[PDB]
Amino acid sequence: GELPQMTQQLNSDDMQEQLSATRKFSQILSDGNEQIQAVIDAGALPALVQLLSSPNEQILQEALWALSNIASGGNEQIQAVIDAGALPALVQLLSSPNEQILQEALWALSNIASG
Amino acid sequence: GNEQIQAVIDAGALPALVQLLSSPNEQILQEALWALSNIASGGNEQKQAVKEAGALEKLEQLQSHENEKIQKEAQEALEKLQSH
């Protein structure tokens, strides 16, 4: 008269979302990427992004280009422009019909994300 | 660096990405791939964003997408979600 007591009932469940970034690709040299931060300026960089809210695609793209130069510069630079509401800018302009503006927005925000 | 994603994720990376992760325009989708992967590789469970976006399945799918650029980076994006 044995008492067979071996109940296998365990909830085998754990999440697989640990700390892993696994690579970051950023190879670009526009020359002066850091230098413009050395210059600093009174408010060129916050202006660069303020320009992005204009109704002129060409002002957008030229300023976005300047953002991109800085955004691909480093963390020290991205956070300077992010602080001016840069995020708002590229995401709003994503609603533009101009599909090259979309990708450029993504490109610049990917730059800042890579900081 | 690290905590910039914290702001990007709040700004609304997903509203754009959820739509355009299916974009037929290479330049857009290939850019979106890095925009997604670069934020997904964050911390403080930053990777949740991809789950809410449901981009996981897109990635796996895009890995077999004829365009090799997307194909390669589509899997690169999974690397940011996974953890070994």
> Helical H runs in A16-56?
35-39, 45-50
Length of chain A: 115
Q: Is the Cβ of B22 closer than 8 Å to some Cβ of chain A? A: no
> Which domain does A86 fall in, by range?
24-115
Q: Which of B19, B3, B23 is nearest to B70 (CA)?
A: B23
Instruction: Mark yes or no for CB contact A103/B35 under 8 Å.
Output: no
Instruction: Mark yes or no for CB contact A113/B1 under 8 Å.
Output: no
**Cα gap B17→A54, rounded to integer Å:** 23
Q: Which residues contact A52 (CB under 8 A, 6 or more apart)?
A: A59, A60, A63, A64, A67, A86, A89, A90, A93
Domain residue ranges in chain B: 1-84
Phi, psi of A77 (to 5 degrees): -85, -40
Residue A21 corresponds to which amino acid?
A
A50 found inside a domain? yes
A31 found inside a domain? yes
A112 found inside a domain? yes
The method of structure determination was NMR
A71 found inside a domain? yes
